[PDB]
Design a protein around this ligand. Structure first.
Ligand SMILES: O=C(O)Cn1c(C(=O)Nc2nc(-c3ccccc3Cl)cs2)cc2ccccc21
Length: 438
């Protein structure tokens, strides 16, 4: 027709510049701001280098020859742009897989797999991803060649084509590429994001709530009351002596801690603490009638209070425990903010009282909600990456099995736009981070 040539220039140019702009924008802000270089964003940086390689060493060398309807570059350029195109897909695919396993480790087995978060391990897999991508994709420059053909009236021209010795090898390669670039990467991705999405669904528990309430302090310190505490809000002694606290501390674990303590000992102590607080609620015969009456998240709010003030300190709140026992939530929330507890620690108390009033985790779900946003962003990046690349890989496979039916139904504009879908992948992710703001 007569529009295709114009629309192709319109579209391929928009896509080329967007991809060049966005990927280098992303490479810039990442090497600039090293606070931004998490483990996640380090694979995101290696994904962005591929997108750029594909935009610069592949997009022109595949559209210009498609517009000219003639491959006017060298035989070596033909071998090259084929080589970087296969490498790009490979790296991107396995970086997405890297991210999914990294997030899985950080969300589903955080204090069980620390190894996969070390940012030196992040540069180890990335180095392995490029190296092995280049190695596995070496048949492209080996078997890529100019195929001479004659447009009408004997005007001789060439075309860059990838031709392995016979039909069986063609079929075996494209089936192998479908396996190691989409089927296997797709399901490892899917099992990971499914488990990630399982944990993130269950939401916030009492250990999460109490971890936000108090943080982690690895050396002795004081509370708003003035008593010595360690780790995640574990009360050592109320005596003013630091010597009685260094003493009570050393007895919490083992060795002479000399004041500073490991994270795994805080967590070991912090689980015994939550153990202690729930045991108190069920041993105090004034709290337990109220505990029984609350749902899971309001139970956690009661556990939070006994964690902070003790079994005996909290059963003192007889007025408020009546109104909770009687499902009167707004009421008991007014009252709890008139207390010394609220006045001593208002931020923590406002949170706990909201939990009591609403029976939800709204007061504590900020870190969870940011995590959900991130994972939902990765699931969109993956899904559009498959959406963008399956067409061209499915067409090359159909060409390796039935070259007649494949070229007869695609060779004009259908493959011209399928190709364009593929190059559109390299400019998708930078627009996605853009919308991840406002
Ligand atoms: O060959 C053509 O000129 C048009 N074409 C094409 C086509 O453009 N195949 C290409 N595959 C890649 C590629 C894809 C994945 C990894 C590495 C690489 Cl290099 C770059 S270009 C397929 C097809 C099917 C039926 C008819 C015409 C057809």
């Amino acid at each position: 027709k007569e529009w295709q040539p114009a629309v192709q220039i319109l579209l391929y140019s928009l896509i080329f510049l967007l991809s060049v702009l966005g990927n280098t924008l992303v490479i810039t802000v990442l090497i600039r701001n090293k606070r931004m270089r998490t483990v996640t964003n380090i694979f995101l940086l290696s994904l962005a280098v591929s997108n750029l390689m594909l935009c610069l060493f592949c997009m022109p060398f595949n559209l210009i020859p498609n517009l000219l309807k003639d491959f006017i570059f060298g035989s070596a350029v033909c071998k090259t742009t084929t080589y970087f195109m296969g490498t790009s897909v490979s790296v991107s695919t396995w970086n997405l897989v890297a991210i999914s396993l990294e997030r899985y480790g950080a969300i589903c087995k955080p204090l069980q797999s620390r190894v996969w978060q070390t940012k030196s391990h992040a540069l180890k897999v990335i180095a392995a991803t490029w190296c092995l991508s280049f190695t596995i994709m070496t048949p492209y420059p080996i078997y890529s060649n100019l195929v001479p053909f004659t447009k009408n009236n004997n005007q001789t021209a060439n075309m860059c084509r990838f031709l392995l010795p016979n039909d069986v090898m063609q079929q075996s390669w494209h089936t192998f590429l479908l396996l190691i670039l989409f089927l296997i990467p797709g399901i490892v991705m899917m099992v990971a994001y499914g488990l990630i999405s399982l944990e993130l669904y269950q939401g916030i528990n009492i250990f999460e709530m109490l971890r936000i309430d108090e943080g982690l302090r690895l050396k002795i310190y004081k509370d708003t009351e003035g008593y010595y505490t360690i780790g995640i809000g574990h009360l050592l002694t109320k005596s003013p002596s630091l010597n009685a606290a260094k003493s009570e501390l050393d007895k919490a674990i083992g060795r002479n801690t000399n004041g500073v303590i490991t994270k795994d000992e805080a967590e070991k102590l912090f689980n015994q603490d939550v153990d202690a607080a729930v045991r108190g609620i069920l041993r105090n015969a004034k709290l337990k009638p109220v505990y029984d009456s609350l749902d899971a998240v309001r139970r956690a709010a009661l556990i939070n209070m006994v964690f902070q003030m003790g079994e005996t300190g909290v059963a003192g709140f007889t007025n408020s425990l009546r109104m909770l026992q009687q499902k009167r939530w707004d009421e008991a929330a007014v009252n709890l903010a008139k207390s010394r507890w609220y006045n001593q620690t208002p931020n923590r108390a406002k949170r706990v009282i909201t939990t009591f009033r609403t029976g939800t985790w709204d007061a504590y779900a900020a870190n969870l909600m940011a995590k959900k946003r991130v994972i939902r962003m990765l699931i969109v990046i993956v899904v559009l990456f498959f959406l963008c690349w399956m067409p061209i890989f499915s067409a090359n496979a159909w060409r390796a099995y039935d070259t007649a039916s494949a070229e007869r139904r695609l060779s004009g504009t259908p493959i011209s736009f399928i190709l364009l879908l593929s190059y559109t992948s390299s400019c998708v992710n930078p627009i996605i981070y853009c919308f991840m703001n406002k």
